[PDB]
Design a protein around this nucleic acid. Structure first.
Ligand SMILES: [Zn+2]
Ligand SMILES: [Zn+2]
Ligand SMILES: [Zn+2]
Length: 85
DNA sequence: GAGGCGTGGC
DNA sequence: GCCACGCCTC
């Protein structure tokens, strides 16, 4: 339904916002800026900025309930959990 | 773990 | 558009 019309691409998406995010791969647009003092990094996706900030802060919101390990991402925790079983 | 990215409820 | 699931590849 939503087609990339940049050059020879033609990739397709189910939401306008997915296509808009995809277009940044062609334009080099990076609207999400880190505001950490002195940093300067910018990203094409908001969740990429979120991941980046967790590098700055070392915040690990996803705590394993079966051992002491914690993670910055739910998918990391999920894979780790499989190791307990 | 980290980077890239498709995706759908809101 | 945000957020955050979660898959693929390294
Ligand atoms: Zn494209
Ligand atoms: Zn930064
Ligand atoms: Zn554990």
């Amino acid at each position: 339904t939503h087609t990339c019309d940049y050059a020879g691409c033609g990739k397709t998406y189910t939401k306008s916002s997915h296509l808009k995010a995809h277009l940044r791969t062609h334009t080099g647009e990076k609207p999400y800026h880190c505001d950490w003092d002195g940093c300067g990094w910018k990203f094409a996706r908001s969740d990429e900025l979120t991941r980046h900030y967790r590098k700055h802060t070392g915040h690990r919101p996803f705590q394993c309930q079966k051992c002491d390990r914690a993670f910055s991402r739910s998918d990391h925790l999920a894979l780790h959990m499989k190791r307990h079983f």
